Structures are given as C-alpha cells and as structure tokens.
Amino acid sequence: KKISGGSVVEMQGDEMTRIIWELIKEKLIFPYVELDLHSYDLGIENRDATNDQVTKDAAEAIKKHNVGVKCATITPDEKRVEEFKLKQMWKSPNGTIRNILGGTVFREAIICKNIPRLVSGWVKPIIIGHHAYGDQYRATDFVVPGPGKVEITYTPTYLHNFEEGGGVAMGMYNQDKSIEDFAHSSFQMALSKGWPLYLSTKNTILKKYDGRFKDIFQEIYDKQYKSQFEAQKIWYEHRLIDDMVAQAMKSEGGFIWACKNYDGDVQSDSVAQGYGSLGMMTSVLVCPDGKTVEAEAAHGTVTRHYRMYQKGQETSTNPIASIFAWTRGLAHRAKLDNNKELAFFANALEEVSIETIEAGFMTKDLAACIKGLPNVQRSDYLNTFEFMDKLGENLKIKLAQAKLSL
Amino acid sequence: KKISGGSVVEMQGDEMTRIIWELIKEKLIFPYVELDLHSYDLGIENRDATNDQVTKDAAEAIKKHNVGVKCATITPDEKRVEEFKLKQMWKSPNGTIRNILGGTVFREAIICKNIPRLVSGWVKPIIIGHHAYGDQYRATDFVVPGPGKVEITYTVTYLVHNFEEGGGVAMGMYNQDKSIEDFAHSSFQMALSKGWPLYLSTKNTILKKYDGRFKDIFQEIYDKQYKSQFEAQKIWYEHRLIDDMVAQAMKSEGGFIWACKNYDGDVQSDSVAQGYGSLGMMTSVLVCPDGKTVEAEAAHGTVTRHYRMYQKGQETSTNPIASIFAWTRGLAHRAKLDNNKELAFFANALEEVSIETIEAGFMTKDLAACIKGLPNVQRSDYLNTFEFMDKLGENLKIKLAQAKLSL
Numbered sequence: 001k002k003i004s005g006g007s008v009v010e011m012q013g014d015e016m017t018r019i020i021w022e023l024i025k026e027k028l029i030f031p032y033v034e035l036d037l038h039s040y041d042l043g044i045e046n047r048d049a050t051n052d053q054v055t056k057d058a059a060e061a062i063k064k065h066n067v068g069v070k071c072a073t074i075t076p077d078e079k080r081v082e083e084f085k086l087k088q089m090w091k092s093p094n095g096t097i098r099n100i101l102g103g104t105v106f107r108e109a110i111i112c113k114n115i116p117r118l119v120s121g122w123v124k125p126i127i128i129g130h131h132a133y134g135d136q137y138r139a140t141d142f143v144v145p146g147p148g149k150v151e152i153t154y155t156p157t158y159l160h161n162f163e164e165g166g167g168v169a170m171g172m173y174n175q176d177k178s179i180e181d182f183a184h185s186s187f188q189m190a191l192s193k194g195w196p197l198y199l200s201t202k203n204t205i206l207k208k209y210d211g212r213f214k215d216i217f218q219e220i221y222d223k224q225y226k227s228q229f230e231a232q233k234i235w236y237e238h239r240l241i242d243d244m245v246a247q248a249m250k251s252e253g254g255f256i257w258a259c260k261n262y263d264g265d266v267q268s269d270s271v272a273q274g275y276g277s278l279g280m281m282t283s284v285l286v287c288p289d290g291k292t293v294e295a296e297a298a299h300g301t302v303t304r305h306y307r308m309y310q311k312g313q314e315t316s317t318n319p320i321a322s323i324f325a326w327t328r329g330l331a332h333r334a335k336l337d338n339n340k341e342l343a344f345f346a347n348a349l350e351e352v353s354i355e356t357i358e359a360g361f362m363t364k365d366l367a368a369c370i371k372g373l374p375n376v377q378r379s380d381y382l383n384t385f386e387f388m389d390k391l392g393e394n395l396k397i398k399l400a401q402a403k404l405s406l
Numbered sequence: 407k408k409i410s411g412g413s414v415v416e417m418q419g420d421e422m423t424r425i426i427w428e429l430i431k432e433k434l435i436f437p438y439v440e441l442d443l444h445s446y447d448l449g450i451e452n453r454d455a456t457n458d459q460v461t462k463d464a465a466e467a468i469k470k471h472n473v474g475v476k477c478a479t480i481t482p483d484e485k486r487v488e489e490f491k492l493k494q495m496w497k498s499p500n501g502t503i504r505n506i507l508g509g510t511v512f513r514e515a516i517i518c519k520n521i522p523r524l525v526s527g528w529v530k531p532i533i534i535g536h537h538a539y540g541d542q543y544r545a546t547d548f549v550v551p552g553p554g555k556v557e558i559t560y561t562v563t564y565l566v567h568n569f570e571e572g573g574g575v576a577m578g579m580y581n582q583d584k585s586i587e588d589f590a591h592s593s594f595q596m597a598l599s600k601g602w603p604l605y606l607s608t609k610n611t612i613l614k615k616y617d618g619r620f621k622d623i624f625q626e627i628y629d630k631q632y633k634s635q636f637e638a639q640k641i642w643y644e645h646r647l648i649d650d651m652v653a654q655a656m657k658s659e660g661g662f663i664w665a666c667k668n669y670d671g672d673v674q675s676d677s678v679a680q681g682y683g684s685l686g687m688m689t690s691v692l693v694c695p696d697g698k699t700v701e702a703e704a705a706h707g708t709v710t711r712h713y714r715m716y717q718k719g720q721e722t723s724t725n726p727i728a729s730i731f732a733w734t735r736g737l738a739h740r741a742k743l744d745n746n747k748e749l750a751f752f753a754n755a756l757e758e759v760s761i762e763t764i765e766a767g768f769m770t771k772d773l774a775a776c777i778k779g780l781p782n783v784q785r786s787d788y789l790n791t792f793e794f795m796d797k798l799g800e801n802l803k804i805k806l807a808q809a810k811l812s813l
C-alpha cells in the first residue's frame with residue numbers, strides 16, 4: 001500500500017527543471033505516495049496558449065487546497081518572445097502567484113557537511129525573506145524627455161525642477177496591508193522553524209517609509225506573537241543592515257532574516273550564494289494565515305544544461321532544490337492533515353538526499369565546490385540520471401529499513 | 407631638506423579620528439613633506455559656529471586646488487543636536503562636499519596577508535563605487551494618512567496608486583542625465599587611474615526604463631571617450647547583472663571596480679568593510695568627472711566609543727590605516743598632477759610601511775581580533791593607538807633612510 005498524501009497543487013515548468021521534475025515524481029514520490037493531485041502546466045507554451053490564465057488558475061487552486069509545489073519556469077524577455085513567437089512578454093508566474101496569494105518568499109539553503117560555505121561556521125541556514133511587489137506595493141517610472149517640473153501630489157504637493165536637459169523619474173507606494181502581510185508571514189515562518197526573526201533596514205534616508213515597517217512589525221509582534229515566541233524560547237528584533245551582516249558572519253546560522261529594501265539586496269542576496277551551489281537553494285512562499293504555502297526551487301530552468309540534453313549530451317544537474325520543494329510541500333501538507341506517515345516520508349527523503357551527498361555521491365556543481373572546477377574529473381561526480389537513480393535506490397533502502405522496525 | 411609637496415586642502419574632523427589625524431600629520435607627514443596647506447576645520451563645533459559655511463568653503467577650495475584629504479566627521483542626528491546644543495541638524499559634510507564637487511565615492515580596502523577576508527582568494531581589493539544623491543538626484547517620501555489618490559505629474563500624468571482602503575506610505579525620486587553622466591565619467595576615470603576593469607551592476611528587474619538609461623549612458627560615454635584608452639591598458643567596461651556580479655566576486659582574486667547602482671543614496675555602508683576584516687582598513691576616494699580632482703577620506707566614522715575611553719583617560723586601540731591611506735592616496739594624486747617623483751615615492755613608501763608593520767605582527771586590537779577572535783585576544787597581541795603610531799613612525803624613518811642609502 002502507498003501513503004495517502006492528500007490534496008496537492010503541482011505546477012509543471014520548463015527546460016531542464018521540467019525533465020528533473022518528472023524524474024522526481026516517477027522515482028521519489030509516486031512509488032511511495034498516492035496524491036489527490038491538481039496539476040497545472042505552467043510551461044511557457046501552455047501559458048502563451050492560455051493567455052497566462054493557467055498561472056491564475058494555479059494560484060487560485062493553491063489558495064483553495066493550501067499546498068503548492070512548483071517547477072522552475074521561464075520568465076520571458078525579448079529573446080524568449082522571438083524564440084517561442086510569444087503573443088506578449090508575459091509576467092513572471094512567480095510574481096503572479098505571490099501577488100494572488102499575498103505571501104512572502106523565503107529562501108533556505110540545504111547544508112551538507114562536506115560542501116563548503118562562505119563562512120565555515122554556518123551549520124544551519126540563514127533563511128532570507130523578501131518584500132516584493134504586489135497589488136498594494138508597486139512602482140512606475142518614466143523618461144522625462146526634457147525641461148519641466150516633476151511633482152508628486154496627494155488628493156483627498158511634493159516637488160525636482162528640471163531646467164536643463166532630460167532625465168528619469170519614478171514613484172512608489174506601499175499600503176499598510178502589504179506590510180502587515182509581510183510581518184504576519186515572517187512571524188508565521190519563525191514559529192514554523194522555531195528560530196528567531198530579524199527585520200533589517202538601513203540608514204533612514206526615507207525615514208517615514210522605513211519607520212512604518214519597524215512600527216507595524218513591532219505592533220503585530222507585541223499583540224499577536226510575543227506570547228508564542230517566548231513559549232518556544234525565540235524572539236523578534238529589528239536590526240540595522242550592517243549589524244545584520246556582522247551577526248551573520250559570526251554565527252552558526254539558524255535565524256530568519258526579513259530583508260527590507262526597494263526590491264532587492266546586495267548582501268542578503270550575497271548570503272544566498274554563499275552555500276556553494278544554486279542547486280541547493282529552495283524558496284517557500286508563506287501566506288499571512290500560516291496555512292497556505294507554495295514550495296519551489298530558488299534557481300532557474302538551467303537552460304544551458306537543457307541545450308546539452310537536447311543535443312543528447314550528458315548533463316549533471318543538481319535536483320536537490322527541486323526535491324526539497326516536494327519535501328517541504330509534503331511536510332506542510334502533513335502538518336495540516338495531521339498525517340504521521342507523510343511527515344515521516346518527507347523527512348526521510350530529505351535525510352536520504354543529504355546522506356547521499358555526504359557519502360560522496362553528487363552532481364558536478366557540488367564536486368566543484370569541494371575541489372574547484374578546474375580539478376574536477378569525471379570520476380568525481382554523477383550525471384543527472386545516475387544521481388537520481390542513486391537517490392531512488394537509497395530512498396527505497398531507507399523506507400524498507402523503516403518498515404522492518406515493526 | 408623636506409619634499410616639496412605642493413597644494414593640498416586638509417579638513418579636520420571629530421572625536422577619535424581627529425586625535426589620530428594630528429598624530430598622522432605630526433609623525434608621518436610633516437617631518438618629511440612641506441605642504442602648501444589649506445586647512446579647514448570641519449569639526450562639529452566649528453561647523454555649528456560657521457552655520458556649516460566652513461564645509462562649503464572647504465569644498466570650493468578642493469575644486470580650486472584639486473586635492474583634498476579629510477578626517478572623519480560627525481553627521482548630526484537628534485541625539486547629536488541635544489549633545490552639542492546644535493543650531494540645526496546640519497547636513498553631512500561628505501554629502502555637501504560630494505554635491506558641490508559632483509563626484510563619485512569609491513571605497514577600497516587595504517589588504518594585509520595575515521588578515522583574513524571573507525573570501526580567502528582575494529589578494530587585491532574590489533573597489534565599490536556608489537551613485538549618491540545630489541543636486542540632480544533626490545527623493546522625498548511621505549505618510550499617506552488615508553483613502554485617496556497618489557499621482558506623479560510632469561509639465562503628462564502617471565498614477566502611482568488609487569488608495570481605496572486604509573493608509574500607507576509613498577515616495578518619489580528623480581535623476582537627471584547629467585548626474586548619470588558624471589557617475590559614468592567618474593567611474594571610467596577611476597578605472598583608468600587604477601588600470602583595472604570596470605563593471606556597472608544593475609538588477610534589470612523592476613524599474614526597466616530607469617535602469618536602461620544608466621546602461622545606455624554608460625555605453626555611449628564608453629564607446630565615444632574611453633574604449634580607446636581602455637584597450638590601451640588591456641582593460642574593459644562591461645554591464646553586468648547583480649547576481650552575476652556577486653558570483654564573480656566570490657570566485658575572483660579581486661582587482662576590479664564595481665560601480666553599484668541601487669535605489670539608495672550613499673549609505674554609511676560599514677557592510678563592505680567586513681568583507682576585509684575591519685572598518686579601520688577601508689578608505690573612500692571621491693573622484694570627479696574631470697579626472698583631475700579627488701578627495702580622500704577614511705570610510706569609517708569618528709569611532710565615538712574609543713573617543714569616550716580617551717576622554718576618561720583609558721587606553722584605546724584605534725586603527726589609523728584608513729586615515730593614513732587618505733593622506734597617501736591624496737598625496738599620490740597630488741604627485742601625479744604635479745609630476746613629482748619624490749612625493750609619489752614617499753606616498754607609496756608610507757603605504758608599504760603600513761602594510762609591512764601589520765604583516766610583521768604589530769597591529770591594533772581590531773586586527774588582532776580578525777586573526778584570533780575577540781574572546782582570545784590578550785593585551786600582548788596588540789598595540790594601543792599611540793604605540794602603533796610610534797611603531798609606524800619608527801618604520802617610516804627606517805624605510806626613507808634605506809631609500810637614501812641605496813641606488
């Protein structure tokens with residue numbers, strides 16, 4: 001008999017990750033787990049053909065069933081429009097889903113003991129959350145073509161005066177609800193992992209903007225979470241950005257870092273490339289309710305490897321991030337459904353994945369972290385299919401051993 | 407006889423750095439170099455007393471003489487207003503000088519072989535340039551108190567949002583082409599100076615028409631005024647995405663210039679300086695578009711915590727290297743303009759002595775902590791502020807004496 005997994009929304013993606021996604025389902029998931037599966041094809045051709053409606057349908061399904069697992073997808077640019085003769089330069093499906101669900105995306109590395117990190121002291125990951133654009137947080141910019149007068153007004157006035165040539169201008173807004181969501185999601189994520197949370201900001205050039213974040217986080221923390229935080233021996237703290245990197249540099253990890261800048265970062269984003277390889281980084285979209293999540297690999301579709309696969313050439317694409325999307329999705333599914341057997345399985349597959357790598361069986365990217373790419377020989381790593389087979393083989397052994405303990 | 411140094415604008419600063427600035431002049435510079443010195447006191451009390459006019463006078467002097475060397479200064483906030491009973495919350499003098507001169511500030515670490523970095527492969531520094539606010543690049547923000555309609559208009563209307571629910575915050579920002587052209591010019595001039603390649607980083611993501619104007623302006627200026635000179639020195643310019651930029655940094659030896667373009671002014675980014683061990687090892691150089699005018703400065707602040715100890719007669723271990731390298735990089739640029747072989751030699755000698763001293767095991771407590779970890783640092787592992795300056799002064803004398811004795 002298989003494990004009764006329950007309701008899961010799955011989203012198929014593009015290029016190399018799509019290949020790997022099917023191998024994961026065929027070899028690691030479906031042999032052991034029966035799922036009420038709600039499948040949406042977010043591959044670029046089906047998105048074009050549906051006018052991106054499939055992305056919206058998928059997001060609504062996640063809102064309804066609480067658990068999404070998604071494969072990496074192509075975000076179209078001009079070259080992609082010419083390649084697929086697309087109808088429009090469609091918006092990132094990640095953006096569209098995150099917008100509809102209202103969540104915050106949190107990136108978390110998978111640490112293996114034999115893989116170097118930026119800072120060798122890190123034994124647990126530092127989870128980094130971002131405040132991204134949505135329905136209630138957006139910006140327009142435009143080319144100021146010549147001399148004039150830019151103003152920004154509020155109707156129930158704030159000035160430049162352009163007297164010489166041209167330039168550019170912009171505007172940006174943020175509703176309290178958008179910030180409250182970001183706060184809620186971040187506290188929910190902290191309670192889930194049992195780790196402390198830090199909101200980072202900088203400097204206060206836009207003082208009234210950053211102050212609204214600090215205040216909203218503090219208000220929500222004091223009134224709805226502090227009791228639950230102390231209960232788990234954890235805390236919330238606002239922190240400056242420089243003190244945040246300082247702390248990261250000198251810690252073992254195991255905290256959540258909610259980053260607040262004007263749609264990205266230089267040093268938040270630097271920590272997330274400091275765990276060796278892009279194949280070891282997952283995303284989890286966490287909604288304010290605590291109840292709904294969407295799991296996804298943080299990397300892209302791995303186009304370069306896909307082109308090799310199309311020419312029949314050997315690839316060594318790391319499936320770990322994609323596997324951990326399934327395991328973190330299924331783990332959340334199990335917590336909602338109170339399903340002991342599925343929670344066990346999800347954890348088992350995570351253990352097998354790390355054990356396999358720690359035992360010396362790995363894809364080329366991870367071999368390169370250890371040895372340096374110039375020193376990597378073919379004997380040092382497995383190809384995409386060899387590594388998936390090795391995982392599949394170890395997973396079977398692990399679950400067989402579990403069953404043999406009565 | 408002393409070295410004829412020429413015209414230099416010097417700016418005195420605040421708290422611990424002011425103490426150190428005088429020690430550097432007394433022990434490392436004035437014994438060996440005669441300077442036509444134009445001195446401005448940008449200490450906070452003299453700024454308050456002149457209604458910040460001294461900062462403006464200093465900036466105009468730099469514009470005139472081409473070389474500024476500045477000590478770290480207090481940037482007032484509310485607490486500083488109460489502490490000194492200031493007349494106004496005066497603007498950062500760095501901002502005021504950078505604005506008047508129109509330059510771009512570039513931060514560069516000083517690497518010593520025995521001091522750990524973030525990435526152990528780094529043997530040369532990665533110089534990071536910032537596009538900061540000025541006369542032609544500025545932003546306002548404000549609290550949207552309730553339901554309404556934010557708009558941004560041009561003498562054409564652009565909706566920022568329709569607020570139909572509760573409150574929020576908004577902002578606006580502008581940028582003139584000239585401000586971007588300056589930033590480009592300064593970055594290419596800086597690259598030619600160091601002989602290293604240049605990378606402009608953006609995140610092509612969010613505000614496409616804004617970032618596109620930067621990319622284009624950099625490319626236009628490069629193609630028309632610099633590419634000939636760049637190829638001449640075996641270097642290049644390249645636009646790059648931000649993630650590919652950190653990737654490259656992670657896996658390189660260093661020795662490139664990274665022009666960063668984000669949506670901040672100049673921050674007090676003490677975060678870059680914890681790549682290279684300690685804040686005492688990070689200098690700033692303000693480079694103007696002309697190539698001709700520079701202002702050198704330590705990247706760190708005034709080191710208030712150490713100053714408070716100094717006021718109570720307690721021993722300090724404050725690292726002077728960044729402050730020393732402000733003088734050496736200033737004097738090096740002075741020497742290049744004046745075509746002064748002797749001053750260029752001296753400037754380089756003092757840099758070598760500084761690194762040699764640290765590499766020989768004599769260092770301030772901050773650097774001892776990089777090596778051993780702060781909990782494991784004993785008093786025998788480091789020198790106090792005055793002990794370390796003496797050691798530098800003593801080694802400098804030896805180095806210049808050896809130079810005199812040789813071919």
Ligand SMILES: NC(=O)c1ccc[n+]([C@@H]2O[C@H](COP(=O)([O-])OP(=O)(O)OC[C@H]3O[C@@H](n4cnc5c(N)ncnc54)[C@H](OP(=O)(O)O)[C@@H]3O)[C@@H](O)[C@H]2O)c1
Pocket residue numbers: 071072073074075076094278279296297298299300301302303304305316317318319365
């Ligand atoms: N999750 C998403 O939906 C998502 C997010 C962002 C971008 N994208 C999209 O993905 C597409 C391709 O992106 P991209 O090529 O710029 O970045 P990418 O797909 O992440 O791949 C870039 C390079 O990173 C390395 N890499 C990434 N994942 C790997 C893995 N699992 N195993 C081994 N190596 C890995 C490879 O380096 P080597 O060449 O050294 O082997 C690869 O060529 C684009 O259309 C982009 O818009 C999708």
Ligand SMILES: NC(=O)c1ccc[n+]([C@@H]2O[C@H](COP(=O)([O-])OP(=O)(O)OC[C@H]3O[C@@H](n4cnc5c(N)ncnc54)[C@H](OP(=O)(O)O)[C@@H]3O)[C@@H](O)[C@H]2O)c1
Pocket residue numbers: 477478479480481482500674676685686703704705706707708709710711712723724725726772
């Ligand atoms: N250069 C400038 O003109 C400039 C620019 C921006 C701001 N500031 C001003 O600097 C003032 C102080 O800023 P802050 O409170 O952030 O302090 P800071 O001067 O940045 O220094 C903070 C801490 O960093 C360490 N540190 C910095 N420089 C050091 C050196 N040369 N040697 C040894 N340790 C060093 C010390 O660490 P430990 O405490 O661990 O010993 C110190 O307590 C503020 O009023 C600020 O406005 C000046």
Ligand SMILES: CC(C)c1ccc(Nc2nc3cc(C(=O)O)ccc3n2[C@H]2C[C@@H](C)CC(C)(C)C2)cc1
Pocket residue numbers: 118245248249266267268270271274524532534652655656666668675677678679680681682
């Ligand atoms: C926690 C850990 C991962 C970490 C440690 C130090 C920093 N330091 C750091 N802060 C930076 C701010 C800007 C900016 O505001 O534009 C740019 C580059 C910055 N860096 C450095 C990033 C480094 C990978 C390379 C570098 C050349 C030393 C610059 C950041 C992260």
